Amino acid sequence: HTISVFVGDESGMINRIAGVFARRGYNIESLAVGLNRDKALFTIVVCGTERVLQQVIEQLQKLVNVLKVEDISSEPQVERELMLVKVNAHPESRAEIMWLVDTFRARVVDIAEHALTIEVTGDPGKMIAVERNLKKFQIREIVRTGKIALRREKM
Amino acid sequence: GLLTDEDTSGLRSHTLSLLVNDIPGVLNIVTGVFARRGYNIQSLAVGHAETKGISRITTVIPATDESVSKLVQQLYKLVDVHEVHDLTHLPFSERELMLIKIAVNAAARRDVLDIASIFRAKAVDVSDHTITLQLTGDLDKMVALQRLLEPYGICEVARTGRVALARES
Amino acid sequence: HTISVFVGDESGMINRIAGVFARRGYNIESLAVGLNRDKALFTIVVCGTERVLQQVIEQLQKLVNVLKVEDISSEPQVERELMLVKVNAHPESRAEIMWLVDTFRARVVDIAEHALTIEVTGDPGKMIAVERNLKKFQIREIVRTGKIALRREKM
Amino acid sequence: TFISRFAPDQPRKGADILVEALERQGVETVFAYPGGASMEIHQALTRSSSIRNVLPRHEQGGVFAAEGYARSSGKPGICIATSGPGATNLVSGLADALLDSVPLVAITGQVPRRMIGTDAFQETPIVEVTRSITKHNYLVMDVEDIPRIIEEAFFLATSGRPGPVLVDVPKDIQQQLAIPNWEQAMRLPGYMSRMPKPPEDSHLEQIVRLISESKKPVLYVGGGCLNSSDELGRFVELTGIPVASTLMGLGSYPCDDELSLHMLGMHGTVYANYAVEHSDLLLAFGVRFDDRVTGKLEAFASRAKIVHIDIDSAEIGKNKTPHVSVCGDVKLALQGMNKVLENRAEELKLDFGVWRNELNVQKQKFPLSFKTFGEAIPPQYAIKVLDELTDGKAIISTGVGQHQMWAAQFYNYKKPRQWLSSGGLGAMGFGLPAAIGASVANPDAIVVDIDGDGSFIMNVQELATIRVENLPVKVLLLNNQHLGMVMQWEDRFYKANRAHTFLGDPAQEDEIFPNMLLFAAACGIPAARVTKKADLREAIQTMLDTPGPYLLDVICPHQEHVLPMIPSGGTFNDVITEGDGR
Amino acid sequence: TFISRFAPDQPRKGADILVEALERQGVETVFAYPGGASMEIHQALTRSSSIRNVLPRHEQGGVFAAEGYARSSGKPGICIATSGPGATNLVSGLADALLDSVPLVAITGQVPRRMIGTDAFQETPIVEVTRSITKHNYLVMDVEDIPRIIEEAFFLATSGRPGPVLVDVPKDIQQQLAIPNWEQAMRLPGYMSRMPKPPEDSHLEQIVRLISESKKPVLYVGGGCLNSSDELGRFVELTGIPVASTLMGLGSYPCDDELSLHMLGMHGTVYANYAVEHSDLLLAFGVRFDDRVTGKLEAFASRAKIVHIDIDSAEIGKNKTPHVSVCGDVKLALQGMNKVLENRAEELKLDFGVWRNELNVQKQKFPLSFKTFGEAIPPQYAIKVLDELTDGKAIISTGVGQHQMWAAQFYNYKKPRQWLSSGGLGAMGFGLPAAIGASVANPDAIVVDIDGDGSFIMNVQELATIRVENLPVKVLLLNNQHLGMVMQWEDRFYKANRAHTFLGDPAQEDEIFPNMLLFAAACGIPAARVTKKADLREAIQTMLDTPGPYLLDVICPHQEHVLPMIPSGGTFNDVITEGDGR
Ligand SMILES: Cc1cc2nc3c(=O)[nH]c(=O)nc-3n(C[C@H](O)[C@H](O)[C@H](O)COP(=O)(O)OP(=O)(O)OC[C@H]3O[C@@H](n4cnc5c(N)ncnc54)[C@H](O)[C@@H]3O)c2cc1C
Ligand SMILES: Cc1cc2nc3c(=O)[nH]c(=O)nc-3n(C[C@H](O)[C@H](O)[C@H](O)COP(=O)(O)OP(=O)(O)OC[C@H]3O[C@@H](n4cnc5c(N)ncnc54)[C@H](O)[C@@H]3O)c2cc1C
Ligand SMILES: Cc1ncc(C[n+]2csc(CCOP(=O)(O)OP(=O)(O)O)c2C)c(N)n1
Ligand SMILES: Cc1ncc(C[n+]2csc(CCOP(=O)(O)OP(=O)(O)O)c2C)c(N)n1
Ligand SMILES: [Mg+2]
Ligand SMILES: [Mg+2]
């Protein structure tokens, strides 16, 4: 139930897009978008049935700036979702987040004496692990990008 | 016209870490402000924050901090915004994944994965038609790979936009 | 506010260079130099305004042996600064410097029972991390080279 | 092209461009209301001798006029207004034009760019309030965009699924001096990339093959064939598939022949309800399956296979999903459908009249009948004799409710572009400025205009704008002293609870209120108060006698009900032939 | 203790939960255009007599009635529209209440929640349309949290910058039955983080440490003193600062005391612009610092030290950079200004007679005169005639335009909220419906109203709302057959033409158009028509004793123009000295 949108030359491209999930009342599970001077590739997962997914893949094409909408859900995708978790870096409990960032195989970008910041990347199954497994240590502030998908293309 | 373009920054390029409720339309109330304040949104990446029930939007706005002070308190005029943080005048992590499908042959795939080994890009999916990298890090490493993969048969660069937290260090 | 200097055939090349920051009264933030039989590439960061930086990039060319001075500050550089920190290797507190050298991703060249020696390398943002984050363990003797820069060259 | 009223190789103001930009798109009339920022267009709109700005009073009446002038042309209407309130009253007509698919261009004078965002002067964020209710909108930022904006605007308004377009031009942008490249082509790659193709011919036989396994088909026309003069009726003249229109489908088929069924649906006629629900082949032809049509989500033609064809890809199967579908402009999609059936002439007859006569025995049995109660004039009689007084050439306009319904289920609309109403929106106060626009797109047609109890008074702003322009806005009044549609809602659903559904003063119950004859005397129109059986057609005779406008206060009984009225979201079995007001 | 209409454990229709939650805030008058989709709330109204339905004739009139009832009471006014098209007609008045900082609540029905945004019937996704122009929206999806958001709406109506809250309810939500869980807290977690705390005197020290540093102060008050009845008058009783009242603040300072600077800015009084453009400390109490008061951002009192007190944090620094800035509820922080500075009452400056001498020599040298060209009534006289006759205090509504400032510069106001304005929106059509809401906020009190020739006609439908509600509105129609604001914006901008300014009929331009006598007599209301000064005091004499409402019709001379008027981005150096229409 996830959608990739490619859009064209306008400003506030998201406002056309994030409108027509709200004004259509069909909730987005997550969203992220690599905007540029004229191009942007949205990746929107919408927690709805495949019937209402069939609407919003075409109702988003009722917008004008959308160059392409492809429901990427049926494909074998690569759902990769970054999550820059800032964790309380207390060395009584930092000492196991060491491997518990090595397991998820993520860099640790900035460390303080009470705040380290990791860069967990990939499958949302692995992301909801970290959102639960590293929740057992006191989390300062999770920020996460949206799930991004692509075609595992073969012919 | 296949690939997403190069980079998502200019000179001004302020970053605002929003912190909003998990309302189903809460993105459109927030970028509704960026539109209604006449701001282009250069990059944006939403997601669920540490307290499950609220969200967190990390934006990129090309506006100087005088105009951003006309936005950070203006985004406070929204109901769902708990806080905004002008991270741009602070040191801050700037990590952004970037899924780059590249159509390559067999021998050129050798001369791509090595570049992906330079950037510590986990080549998440490969075929014979193509290979899809997945690098992560600051936007300069993002634009360096896309400046270096324009020689190769690039495909849909499904980026994700600058995600930020102000480091304490 | 950093400067790369390439100098020619003389001995005590640094004395011409390190003089004309002192006798010009413009403080060096750091310095390092790969001297040789006739060539040496200084890399000098001078904590001053861009006005006084414009002086000393040319006042260092009032010296004769300087083949080239380039203010490398405006370029996208690669500021890489080595820091051979010798840390007290007490195994009650060594046990977390393990990952806290893995995070900064540095070799550990020599270890004793009370003194291990690491090789932290790279961005001065990452170097001032170690100078603060590993300061929370008792540091024997930091030695560090100066920040070295190069052009991230494209055309 | 046309005559250039401006030097084609010289940089001049945005105001020089804007009125010429419409004049380089063949515009003859805009409904422009000047203001704090829109006046700069009006500085140059007077300079266009071609585009006579019909000045409105309310810009809501202006933007309603850009529907009557739209949906009686085929050309898109244009309403120009101002930021602040002028922009925030397009939003009625814009939401009208979104839902009923009325092509429209909403130019709007916007705040200067330095004062944009800050809400300095009257900056409603217009493209941020009207992003929903328009098909597209354009806050322009440079004047060189304005030609490729407006060429895209008239591309987006007219072509595609024809909806409204807005354009925000800032006040300094209209003052800014630049170059009008009409051959600055449309940088609109998204819309033209799936601007819908002509349907392929082998796909068209698949509909024709579905007639062969359907002895009981029904043609379900909506506003798609509003661009077809005879192209729908010729298809029914080719193949005996019975018509069944919807509300905006009225007019598109000539609804006065003997095959002619009527508007189907919840307040649609019950002898059109049997045809749609007993059928096997819904020919949903340019129509969007609304909720005043389906009743229940499943009990709308559950025993029928559906072909739904439409100019929108997205609208196909937005409701319950059809079986076969083209994304064809049905004006064109008929013109390949009719191509095969003049060729494939009579090897399959497809004129099984006993299914048509399954409803021609119901054409009389559940008819457009009612009772006259007393010697006072009954409401739907007067609109009924209006048709025979007007040859069916009179382009109606109406507001919303009973005088939308009693306008709909009685009148014989020969041509399309003849039924001019807010449909899926249901903007009250529509008809009196709908006829204003209809007095320009068909400016010599006999544009009679039924209004109602409330929906007359809501936009008597534009009663001024008849008198400034001398239009045949022949304003019929289906006044019954009470907002009767919601009175018809309140008795058949909830306890007949009069929540001031009566418009007039309830201390002045048994008297006419208001004395809306003097509304016509307020401007200079004559009027007529019709109250009894003694003046049924009589003032309506004098209506078409009087050149220019007229008013016809047909006051009707204070309790009346539209038949039928299925329950909201209700099953097909609860169709009625009743009225409970007396 | 709330008088519950029904049992506290009655599972009933959500409209009963809704309409009880309105009165549980403690409101008494709604403006409810009846519902084909908001049906139950009018039905649940009818089982209540504590709440009053003043059913408007138009929803834009309804929300402007909800505007007038808000800004002539201060209690957060409630409109109700029908879903969809009725809700599009609020978008006018909702754009007023966000721009003019009016505490409004817009209850509206929606469609069934199974049909929301499906391009459905009677639908406008108005929760997403008016996202940009309200303080908050709501799209509640359960019955049990209907009064959750209602008390949150009346929180959001009262708290901060008092904005509108469009509160939507789906039609099937009130058609779903459940029990009202009343006392649940404000689900409002982010807004409490800027729920503005009382700014203490340590924060007010660097104001009163600069009051003695202030040699040339000015009291730039506006819509933030809308609650300051005498607190601003107490503040000037403490320290004596010459005022500068804007439009929503007209009334706040009673503009007949010694420092009687009525209105400042680009269209203000020129001797209050002299008071503001010559200050060294621009003291501001609740202003939004717009373009049409400031001209340039950097030159509007460039030689001043701006302090600016607002309940709204975002407003601080939005249009105008403040020198030192302090937030906080002004009337609360004025009670924490005047009732704390009495320790400094022998310490503070009070040395402003040398600054009171500047205004006194420029009071008459920069006068408020006019031109009695023959006997064609100066309306600027006719409001000085008004307070000569209206016995002092009078709750006055306006449309907007040249007749807006004629209320501003030429009435001696005596209390805040005894004055109405679409100042920030500039809403043409505000006049007559704000006379409705003031006539239920202050019903027995004198609700006088002045309208222009278009803005009266633009919302003239609400004449019928008066006779239904017996309101004593006293409307004065400042007719000049002309768009009176922008005809001066022809002259002082670019050219003295008549480009579409002429509202009237060019066939009877010397005669009245439209005939407002036969407007009010159409709705049975008494009227008048004035052009001579001898009848001017006579007609107002007939006005203020008229039982129920009254209309009159002065004739503004169609070529009379008001000082000042600068292009946007101007200073008092760029004032106009005597600009007319001749
Ligand atoms: C109080 C009230 C009661 C009503 N009762 C009824 C009732 O009982 N029965 C009834 O039928 N209606 C009723 N209506 C009207 C109803 O709300 C809709 O307006 C009606 O369904 C109009 O038909 P449509 O919207 O389906 O077709 P349209 O008005 O044309 O809506 C546009 C749809 O048709 C298609 N279309 C438009 N242009 C083209 C084109 N060029 N080519 C192909 N397709 C095109 C559009 O793409 C879109 O799919 C009522 C309205 C009100 C306000
Ligand atoms: C054509 C035209 C010309 C005009 N020319 C002028 C002119 O020349 N000079 C002039 O003065 N006006 C003029 N006006 C009116 C002007 O647009 C508005 O009056 C003004 O912009 C808004 O009034 P305000 O800022 O004083 O208060 P408001 O904006 O209505 O509200 C007060 C402001 O302070 C804060 N505030 C709100 N509520 C409170 C509270 N309860 N407590 C504390 N603070 C609060 C709010 O942030 C608000 O922004 C003109 C209007 C028009 C249509
Ligand atoms: C702008 C708007 N307001 C309200 C409604 C709801 N509504 C539809 S019909 C109707 C009754 C009013 O019709 P009227 O003009 O009084 O004449 P009638 O049809 O009752 O004879 C109402 C209140 C609407 N669709 N649009
Ligand atoms: C719908 C709309 N159009 C334009 C404007 C800008 N505007 C406000 S007043 C006005 C002309 C004033 O006419 P009127 O309100 O009738 O009063 P008058 O000054 O003529 O006496 C204009 C063009 C507006 N606020 N709203
Ligand atoms: Mg009625
Ligand atoms: Mg006027």
Short mmCIF file of N, CA, C and O in Angstrom, two decimals, chain A residues 8-12 14-17 19-20 23-24 26 51-52 54-56 58-68, chain D residues 98 127 131-133 135-139 148 156 161 187-191 193-194 312-321:
data_model
loop_
_atom_site.label_atom_id
_atom_site.label_comp_id
_atom_site.label_asym_id
_atom_site.label_seq_id
_atom_site.Cartn_x
_atom_site.Cartn_y
_atom_site.Cartn_z
N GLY A 8 6.84 17.55 -11.14
CA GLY A 8 7.53 18.48 -12.02
C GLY A 8 7.71 19.88 -11.48
O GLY A 8 7.86 20.07 -10.28
N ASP A 9 7.70 20.87 -12.37
CA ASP A 9 8.15 22.23 -12.03
C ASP A 9 7.04 22.99 -11.31
O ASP A 9 6.14 23.54 -11.94
N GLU A 10 7.13 23.03 -9.98
CA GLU A 10 6.32 23.92 -9.16
C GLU A 10 7.01 24.08 -7.82
O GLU A 10 7.96 23.37 -7.50
N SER A 11 6.53 25.04 -7.04
CA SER A 11 6.99 25.22 -5.68
C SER A 11 5.85 24.88 -4.72
O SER A 11 4.68 25.15 -5.01
N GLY A 12 6.21 24.30 -3.59
CA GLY A 12 5.21 23.70 -2.74
C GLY A 12 4.60 22.52 -3.47
O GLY A 12 3.37 22.44 -3.60
N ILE A 14 4.75 19.55 -2.39
CA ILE A 14 4.21 18.67 -1.36
C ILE A 14 2.80 19.08 -1.00
O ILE A 14 1.97 18.24 -0.63
N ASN A 15 2.50 20.37 -1.12
CA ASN A 15 1.19 20.88 -0.73
C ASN A 15 0.09 20.39 -1.63
O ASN A 15 -1.03 20.18 -1.17
N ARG A 16 0.39 20.23 -2.91
CA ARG A 16 -0.52 19.50 -3.77
C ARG A 16 -0.64 18.06 -3.28
O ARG A 16 -1.75 17.54 -3.16
N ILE A 17 0.48 17.45 -2.92
CA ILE A 17 0.48 16.03 -2.59
C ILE A 17 -0.09 15.78 -1.21
O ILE A 17 -1.04 15.01 -1.05
N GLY A 19 -1.88 17.63 0.52
CA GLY A 19 -3.29 17.98 0.53
C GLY A 19 -4.16 16.79 0.17
O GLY A 19 -5.04 16.40 0.94
N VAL A 20 -3.86 16.15 -0.95
CA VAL A 20 -4.81 15.22 -1.54
C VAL A 20 -4.71 13.84 -0.92
O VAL A 20 -5.24 12.87 -1.47
N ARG A 23 -7.36 16.01 2.20
CA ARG A 23 -8.66 16.36 1.66
C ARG A 23 -9.38 15.18 1.03
O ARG A 23 -10.58 15.28 0.77
N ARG A 24 -8.68 14.09 0.75
CA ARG A 24 -9.33 12.84 0.43
C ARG A 24 -9.51 11.96 1.66
O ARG A 24 -10.14 10.91 1.55
N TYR A 26 -7.54 10.04 3.31
CA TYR A 26 -6.88 8.75 3.28
C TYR A 26 -5.49 8.93 3.86
O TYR A 26 -4.64 9.60 3.26
N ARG A 51 -8.24 -1.10 -2.86
CA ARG A 51 -9.27 -0.35 -3.57
C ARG A 51 -9.03 1.14 -3.46
O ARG A 51 -8.99 1.86 -4.47
N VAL A 52 -8.83 1.64 -2.23
CA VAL A 52 -8.61 3.07 -2.06
C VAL A 52 -7.20 3.45 -2.48
O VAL A 52 -6.96 4.61 -2.84
N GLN A 54 -6.02 2.23 -5.22
CA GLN A 54 -6.24 2.41 -6.65
C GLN A 54 -6.82 3.79 -6.95
O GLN A 54 -6.57 4.34 -8.03
N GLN A 55 -7.57 4.36 -6.01
CA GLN A 55 -8.06 5.72 -6.18
C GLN A 55 -6.92 6.72 -6.12
O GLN A 55 -6.70 7.48 -7.07
N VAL A 56 -6.16 6.70 -5.02
CA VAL A 56 -5.16 7.73 -4.81
C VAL A 56 -3.94 7.58 -5.70
O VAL A 56 -3.17 8.53 -5.82
N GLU A 58 -4.46 7.29 -8.80
CA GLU A 58 -4.97 8.05 -9.91
C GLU A 58 -5.50 9.41 -9.49
O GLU A 58 -5.45 10.35 -10.28
N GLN A 59 -5.97 9.53 -8.25
CA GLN A 59 -6.41 10.84 -7.78
C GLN A 59 -5.24 11.76 -7.54
O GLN A 59 -5.37 12.98 -7.66
N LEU A 60 -4.06 11.21 -7.25
CA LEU A 60 -2.88 12.04 -7.26
C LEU A 60 -2.49 12.44 -8.68
O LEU A 60 -1.79 13.44 -8.85
N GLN A 61 -2.94 11.71 -9.68
CA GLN A 61 -2.79 12.17 -11.05
C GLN A 61 -3.91 13.10 -11.48
O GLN A 61 -3.93 13.53 -12.62
N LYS A 62 -4.87 13.40 -10.59
CA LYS A 62 -5.71 14.55 -10.87
C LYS A 62 -4.95 15.84 -10.64
O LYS A 62 -5.34 16.88 -11.17
N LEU A 63 -3.89 15.79 -9.85
CA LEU A 63 -2.95 16.89 -9.81
C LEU A 63 -2.22 16.97 -11.13
O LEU A 63 -2.10 16.01 -11.89
N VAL A 64 -1.71 18.16 -11.40
CA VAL A 64 -1.18 18.48 -12.71
C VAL A 64 0.32 18.28 -12.75
O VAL A 64 0.86 17.75 -13.72
N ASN A 65 0.99 18.68 -11.69
CA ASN A 65 2.44 18.64 -11.64
C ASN A 65 3.00 17.24 -11.54
O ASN A 65 4.20 17.06 -11.76
N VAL A 66 2.17 16.24 -11.24
CA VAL A 66 2.66 14.88 -11.09
C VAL A 66 3.05 14.33 -12.45
O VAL A 66 2.22 14.16 -13.34
N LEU A 67 4.34 14.05 -12.61
CA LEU A 67 4.78 13.43 -13.86
C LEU A 67 4.43 11.96 -13.88
O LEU A 67 4.08 11.42 -14.94
N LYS A 68 4.49 11.29 -12.74
CA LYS A 68 4.30 9.85 -12.69
C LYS A 68 3.93 9.46 -11.28
O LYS A 68 4.54 9.94 -10.32
N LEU D 98 -15.43 22.59 -9.41
CA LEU D 98 -14.70 21.35 -9.22
C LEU D 98 -15.63 20.16 -9.30
O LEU D 98 -15.32 19.17 -9.97
N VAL D 127 -3.91 30.33 -3.34
CA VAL D 127 -3.52 29.01 -3.81
C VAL D 127 -3.30 28.04 -2.67
O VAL D 127 -3.14 26.85 -2.91
N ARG D 131 -6.35 25.28 -3.06
CA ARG D 131 -5.62 24.18 -3.66
C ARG D 131 -6.50 22.96 -3.81
O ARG D 131 -6.31 22.17 -4.73
N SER D 132 -7.48 22.81 -2.93
CA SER D 132 -8.39 21.69 -3.03
C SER D 132 -9.41 21.89 -4.14
O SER D 132 -9.57 21.04 -5.02
N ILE D 133 -10.10 23.02 -4.12
CA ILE D 133 -11.36 23.19 -4.82
C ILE D 133 -11.16 23.61 -6.26
O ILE D 133 -12.12 23.89 -6.97
N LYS D 135 -8.94 22.49 -9.95
CA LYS D 135 -8.13 21.48 -10.60
C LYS D 135 -6.66 21.84 -10.50
O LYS D 135 -5.83 21.00 -10.13
N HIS D 136 -6.33 23.08 -10.78
CA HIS D 136 -4.99 23.57 -10.55
C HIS D 136 -5.08 25.04 -10.21
O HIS D 136 -6.11 25.67 -10.40
N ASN D 137 -3.98 25.58 -9.72
CA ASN D 137 -3.92 26.99 -9.44
C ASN D 137 -2.50 27.47 -9.65
O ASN D 137 -1.56 26.68 -9.66
N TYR D 138 -2.34 28.77 -9.82
CA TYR D 138 -1.04 29.31 -10.22
C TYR D 138 -0.81 30.62 -9.51
O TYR D 138 -1.27 31.67 -9.97
N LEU D 139 -0.09 30.58 -8.41
CA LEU D 139 0.52 31.80 -7.92
C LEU D 139 1.70 32.05 -8.83
O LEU D 139 2.74 31.40 -8.72
N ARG D 148 2.62 31.44 -20.48
CA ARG D 148 2.62 29.99 -20.37
C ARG D 148 1.79 29.51 -19.19
O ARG D 148 1.43 28.33 -19.16
N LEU D 156 -5.78 23.60 -19.03
CA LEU D 156 -6.23 22.81 -17.90
C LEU D 156 -7.71 22.97 -17.65
O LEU D 156 -8.38 22.02 -17.25
N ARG D 161 -10.06 16.51 -17.77
CA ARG D 161 -11.28 16.55 -16.99
C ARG D 161 -11.55 18.01 -16.71
O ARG D 161 -10.79 18.62 -15.95
N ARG D 187 4.95 24.62 -20.39
CA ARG D 187 5.86 23.77 -19.62
C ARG D 187 5.07 22.97 -18.58
O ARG D 187 5.30 23.05 -17.38
N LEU D 188 4.13 22.19 -19.09
CA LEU D 188 3.22 21.39 -18.27
C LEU D 188 3.38 19.92 -18.62
O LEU D 188 2.46 19.31 -19.18
N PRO D 189 4.53 19.32 -18.30
CA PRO D 189 4.78 17.96 -18.78
C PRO D 189 3.98 16.91 -18.04
O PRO D 189 3.78 15.82 -18.59
N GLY D 190 3.49 17.21 -16.84
CA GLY D 190 2.77 16.21 -16.09
C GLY D 190 1.38 15.96 -16.64
O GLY D 190 0.96 14.81 -16.78
N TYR D 191 0.67 17.03 -16.98
CA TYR D 191 -0.72 16.84 -17.38
C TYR D 191 -0.82 16.26 -18.78
O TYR D 191 -1.63 15.36 -19.03
N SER D 193 1.27 14.36 -20.19
CA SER D 193 1.81 13.01 -20.26
C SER D 193 0.73 11.95 -20.09
O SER D 193 0.92 10.82 -20.55
N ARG D 194 -0.38 12.28 -19.44
CA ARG D 194 -1.51 11.36 -19.38
C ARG D 194 -2.82 12.10 -19.58
O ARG D 194 -3.88 11.61 -19.15
N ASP D 312 -11.89 11.52 -17.40
CA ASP D 312 -10.94 11.36 -16.31
C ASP D 312 -10.60 9.89 -16.18
O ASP D 312 -11.50 9.04 -16.16
N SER D 313 -9.31 9.59 -16.10
CA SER D 313 -8.90 8.25 -15.70
C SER D 313 -9.27 7.98 -14.25
O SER D 313 -9.77 6.91 -13.92
N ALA D 314 -9.05 8.97 -13.38
CA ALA D 314 -9.19 8.75 -11.95
C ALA D 314 -10.64 8.58 -11.54
O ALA D 314 -10.93 7.86 -10.58
N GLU D 315 -11.55 9.24 -12.25
CA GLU D 315 -12.95 9.17 -11.88
C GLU D 315 -13.56 7.82 -12.21
O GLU D 315 -14.60 7.46 -11.65
N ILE D 316 -12.92 7.07 -13.12
CA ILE D 316 -13.36 5.73 -13.44
C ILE D 316 -13.20 4.84 -12.22
O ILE D 316 -12.09 4.65 -11.71
N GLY D 317 -14.31 4.30 -11.74
CA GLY D 317 -14.27 3.42 -10.59
C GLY D 317 -13.91 4.10 -9.30
O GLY D 317 -13.36 3.46 -8.40
N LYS D 318 -14.17 5.41 -9.19
CA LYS D 318 -14.03 6.07 -7.90
C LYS D 318 -15.06 5.54 -6.91
O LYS D 318 -14.75 5.29 -5.74
N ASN D 319 -16.27 5.33 -7.39
CA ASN D 319 -17.29 4.57 -6.69
C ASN D 319 -17.17 3.11 -7.14
O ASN D 319 -16.08 2.68 -7.51
N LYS D 320 -18.25 2.33 -6.98
CA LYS D 320 -18.28 0.91 -7.35
C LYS D 320 -17.79 0.66 -8.77
O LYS D 320 -18.17 1.36 -9.71
N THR D 321 -16.91 -0.31 -8.90
CA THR D 321 -16.03 -0.38 -10.05
C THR D 321 -16.76 -1.00 -11.24
O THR D 321 -17.42 -2.03 -11.09
#
